[PDB]
Design a protein around this ligand. Sequence first.
Ligand SMILES: O=C(Nc1ccc(Cl)cc1)c1cc2ccccc2cc1OP(=O)(O)O
Ligand SMILES: O=C(Nc1ccc(Cl)cc1)c1cc2ccccc2cc1OP(=O)(O)O
Ligand SMILES: O=C(Nc1ccc(Cl)cc1)c1cc2ccccc2cc1OP(=O)(O)O
Ligand SMILES: O=C(Nc1ccc(Cl)cc1)c1cc2ccccc2cc1OP(=O)(O)O
Lengths: 351, 350, 349, 349
Amino acid sequence: PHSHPALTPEQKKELSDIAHRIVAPGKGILAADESTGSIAKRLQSIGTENTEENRRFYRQLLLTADDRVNPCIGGVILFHETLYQKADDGRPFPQVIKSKGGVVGIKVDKGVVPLAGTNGETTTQGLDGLSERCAQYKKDGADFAKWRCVLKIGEHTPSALAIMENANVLARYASICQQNGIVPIVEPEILPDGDHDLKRCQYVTEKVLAAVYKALSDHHIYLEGTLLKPNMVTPGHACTQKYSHEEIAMATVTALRRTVPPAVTGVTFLSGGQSEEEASINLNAINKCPLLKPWALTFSYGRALQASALKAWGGKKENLKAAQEEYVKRALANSLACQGKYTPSGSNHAY
Amino acid sequence: PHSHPALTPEQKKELSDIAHRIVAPGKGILAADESTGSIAKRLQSIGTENTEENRRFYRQLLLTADDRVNPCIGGVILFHETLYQKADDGRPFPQVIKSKGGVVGIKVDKGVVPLAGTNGETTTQGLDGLSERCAQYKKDGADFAKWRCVLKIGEHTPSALAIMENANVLARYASICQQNGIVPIVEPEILPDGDHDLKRCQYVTEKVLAAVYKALSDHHIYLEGTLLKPNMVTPGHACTQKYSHEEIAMATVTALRRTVPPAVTGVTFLSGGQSEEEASINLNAINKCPLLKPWALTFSYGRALQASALKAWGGKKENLKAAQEEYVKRALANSLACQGKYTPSSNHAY
Amino acid sequence: PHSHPALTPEQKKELSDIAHRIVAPGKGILAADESTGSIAKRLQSIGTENTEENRRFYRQLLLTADDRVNPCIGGVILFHETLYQKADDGRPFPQVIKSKGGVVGIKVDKGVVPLAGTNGETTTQGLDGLSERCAQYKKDGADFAKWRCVLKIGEHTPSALAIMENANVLARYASICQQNGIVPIVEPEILPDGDHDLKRCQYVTEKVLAAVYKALSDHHIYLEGTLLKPNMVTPGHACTQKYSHEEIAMATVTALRRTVPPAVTGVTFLSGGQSEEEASINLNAINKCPLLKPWALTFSYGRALQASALKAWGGKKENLKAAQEEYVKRALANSLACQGKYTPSNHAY
Amino acid sequence: PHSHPALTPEQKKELSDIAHRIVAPGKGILAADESTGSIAKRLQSIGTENTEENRRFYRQLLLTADDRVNPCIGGVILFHETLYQKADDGRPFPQVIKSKGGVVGIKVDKGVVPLAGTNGETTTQGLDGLSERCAQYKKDGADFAKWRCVLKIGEHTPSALAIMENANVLARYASICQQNGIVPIVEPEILPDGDHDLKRCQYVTEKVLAAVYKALSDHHIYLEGTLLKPNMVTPGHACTQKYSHEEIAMATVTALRRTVPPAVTGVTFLSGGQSEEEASINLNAINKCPLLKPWALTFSYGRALQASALKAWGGKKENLKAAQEEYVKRALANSLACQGKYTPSNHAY
Ligand SMILES: O=C(Nc1ccc(Cl)cc1)c1cc2ccccc2cc1OP(=O)(O)O
Ligand SMILES: O=C(Nc1ccc(Cl)cc1)c1cc2ccccc2cc1OP(=O)(O)O
Ligand SMILES: O=C(Nc1ccc(Cl)cc1)c1cc2ccccc2cc1OP(=O)(O)O
Ligand SMILES: O=C(Nc1ccc(Cl)cc1)c1cc2ccccc2cc1OP(=O)(O)O
């Protein structure tokens, strides 16, 4: 029961300032950290060869969008490769991001791995040599990191083991990041797969988040210098019962209010399988919810910010402006939504 | 995991409505639940025989103060004996409290017991037949309960066992209370005993509360239907280093912001060994702290609300007015304090 | 962590000595601690008015059985009421038990209570004032205690909450008992209700026992001064798959070997819904199981020792000898069983 | 909880058979997996240049000792580099070890890393891509693995965090190993550093092992397919109070009896900072301890088996026989020690 300060006042100040800048009023996060294997499907969906040059061009297309996105983007998550690529003018992408007012982020996990003795459950790896990697990323321009854990709702999942293990690994990851001046974004994604209803998702989300914050406490994590990337609370994809955006918002905010300490600087929602417009409407409803919300509630979207842009680009250089135009539109929409000012024009006890 | 609703929407509403009434803006709790074993020294200090009539009288004195205390008192915690006593006009004390706009609370724990294998640490008993007792107290006018767990800061304390066990018993007590329409006030008190500094108290407080809320979650506790009664974050009673009220407020608010979910309806601070004035000044500083506080931050005082009243009374029936006056004075001082409107007469370093 | 001795060397010796005496070779436990409310159904099945008198007589009938049971019974669990009753000759029941070489035990739990937010699960109450009660029971002849926790196998049970809470309360109870010179018998019973199979019971039993011993460790319990009373590992009552006694034994011994520390003095199996013969046959197979067992494997039976005796008695004092004879036969059968010498009339785990 | 078999009966059989062969009667383990960073200081002590050839030669010297060590060595732990080196006759070292009746082990952890917010405490890394590494090591002759976690006794250590985190990572490591047919040796080493006495080390050891076994249960680890490599229970190196070998054996065996399930196939002790003789004498006493021990109690020595050998070699190729002779002597002594055949008041525990 003795304190051996993991961080000095200066380190804490640096971490808190970074966290607040990322989620400042009206700003969200662009998740463009798709791996070479993940971006493969995206490129094949528009008949484009998956080469480093095409990946560079696509990332550049998004990162160099006009100044309208500046007040919309507080952070950009990149994959290792992209962090070391440069725009046509020779400027490193991280420099491009920063010049537009954004904070640079880096995915540091090494994917999921199966947990033996479970019903298809997983944990996430990537702690080995993480400290050295974080130190190097920090020096090369990154100020926050991304690590994704995945849990699934089923007849016997998430199990006590899966919940405990994933929460523990997220805590180790956050601890290492903070020692290197990197703001860790804690991401305990609960998949929407299944036919469960809204109440089930809320229940599981509340249990998962409770475990997550207890682990962060056990590992002496500085909450003010962290962000949370949870799933919104929604029914399963195969759920027959229909719900309004107001219900999704109330269930989501209620779950968060019951588990997330106010010290947490911000919540950057993942959109999962939601469409671009759906992700904006729900994020807006969440911000409109008539309950006290002590943390910034914004976005960290990948598919919900690029979907149309990728399609508009089609891998043709001539559609550059049209592609960027699609991305900018979603950036503005979500900027308004994370403020509860979004519009298509441009009982609590039951939870 | 799988859900099996512990409460219906109707039961949740009842509990949440009660919790909010107790900590309504400007209101706090009067802790007058001293057991016959604790009230003994109180009466002894004023040379008064510890009889049932004298205890009944003293309680009446506090409970029947003029209407100036009404806006200040959201709840009153009573000891079993008192819940069944009556004022001179024949009215049961629970009726007297309610008629003044207050909610009636009842202590339900059965005191602390030693934890074997620890350095003088304890847990708290009182769960046996608690459900039946709560059902009866509810029928007899009580809407909330009190249960006190005690932890101590020392070289090897609080130990992992003490923290886990006390957090678990609080969760059990909370669960049983809510099943009976009684709002449980979770009280995990960390004593000020010792010469530890402010930073040490904040660290321990943070660890204890994280454990308390994880336990409440494990036992499916409805937080909106609960209140928290923690110690403020202050240096040890014998700490050589000195701090300002602002530092105590910052350390306290920070600790809470890092561990207490916004869903918790309110925090009713215990004053520990602080004086009446000090308790009011710190609560005021806490409410003036430049950090976001998603829960009501008020009081649940015993000594800090009765110290002077008890002294002015002195066991003499002719000092009723004088005594009640002192009580009213502190009630008013704290009602303003829990709003940051009281005046006597870098956060990254936390 | 830091050590703050919960017990002195002398206290440890007393507890260990008591534990070993109870489960000494060939000895088991007669569980006769049925509460007046629980015994009511028993006396009802034999048209006998449930009165303190008839309860005293029935208990006397069992406690005063001939000396053939002496080497079979190492301990007797009594209900509060019985601990203070006397035989016709005036001898206090505890004295009767001890004279026959048995250790006196006392039930100290106050029954199960529902756990809100669970699918019909429970925890057990009884810790309030337990220290004072144990000290009084010790002064009055008791050397060990019984506390029963109950878990059930279902679609969502036993839940993490139920497992954690029951293991924790068991540790609290054990801690308090040891502080008063009383050997605590930890009983985490997993009901046989349901249609689950053998491996499902084995799995749950293993998880439950692992939780139980972690809790005992967290609470600084002196294992050598304790006994474990678990269910045998068997398929659910409604399971359609059939198993042999050798399979039940293998599953049972395997489960214990993977969770119970060698330091535990002995395992006193509860018989659950098993008949008298079934309980003896299974205990025998368990003791014959090839695997190495570092603890005594015996019985702590209530229904499996009294069934026939109760029926033979029928509330008629005239049936005293006939009734006692039935009890003696089961006592003898199980004494041989806990030694693997009873005869009526492993990677797959 | 619901069962989702981590292993098939076939997989369990393979792991169990491997574990039993490593600790077969009279057999122990040679720990020659010194990291290239640790071996450097060893070669330095004998003015020998730290080259790949010298390292290869030294390992060859130990692995090619006369047949007298065959009955003594059940397993040999190797570092990655050595696993792929060959003897002068072209035979890969794994083949050499196997031809002498030994099982090949491989160190798979990637060292300790600091735990932020603690008083100099650490956890261990090495899980990333461990499954693929294990599958490859299995194909290359390895049947068991080594992973070391380190805890220290102090005023505020081991902390709740250090214990929990280290037990958890050990469990993750063991799970991945068993999925690849590799027997994991769980090594939660508690350093002897400090002035604490015997009872303090025993207390901490019991708390650590209880946490370790709860974690292995939570992670569904097959205990019969695992081995435990703990520190012997001894006072700190700077402790004033002196203890006899019998007391060390008693405290050590008591700690294990109170925490290690009988299902664990064997305990392979690390010698810490003990001398070659000290390590053999203590192991002998442990095996002679009166208490019941349901698991094999043997050795997994590095310094305690190589000390004299390394000195006799001195980097001189002509001192091969002399060096090997020193190793053989220690292997023979320890082979007898793990049988309690070597000769150069339990309630108080
Ligand atoms: O529509 C997408 N995926 C999907 C749709 C439908 C089914 Cl059935 C499964 C998966 C999608 C589109 C992207 C566009 C641009 C960047 C990243 C993208 C990632 C992405 O997949 P995701 O990582 O958001 O799950
Ligand atoms: O004078 C008191 N306490 C004290 C004095 C001096 C030292 Cl040094 C320590 C503690 C006191 C006075 C009260 C007056 C009226 C109600 C409750 C009272 C409770 C109380 O003691 P407490 O239960 O608040 O600890
Ligand atoms: O025949 C019994 N029970 C039963 C049988 C069959 C079904 Cl289907 C359900 C319940 C029985 C008989 C006893 C006789 C004498 C003492 C204690 C006895 C306890 C007892 O039931 P129990 O308290 O051990 O659960
Ligand atoms: O004498 C040794 N170390 C030591 C001595 C004294 C202090 Cl103070 C600290 C450390 C030693 C000797 C070896 C000889 C041969 C192989 C491996 C060896 C490893 C080894 O160090 P270790 O891994 O056993 O701790």
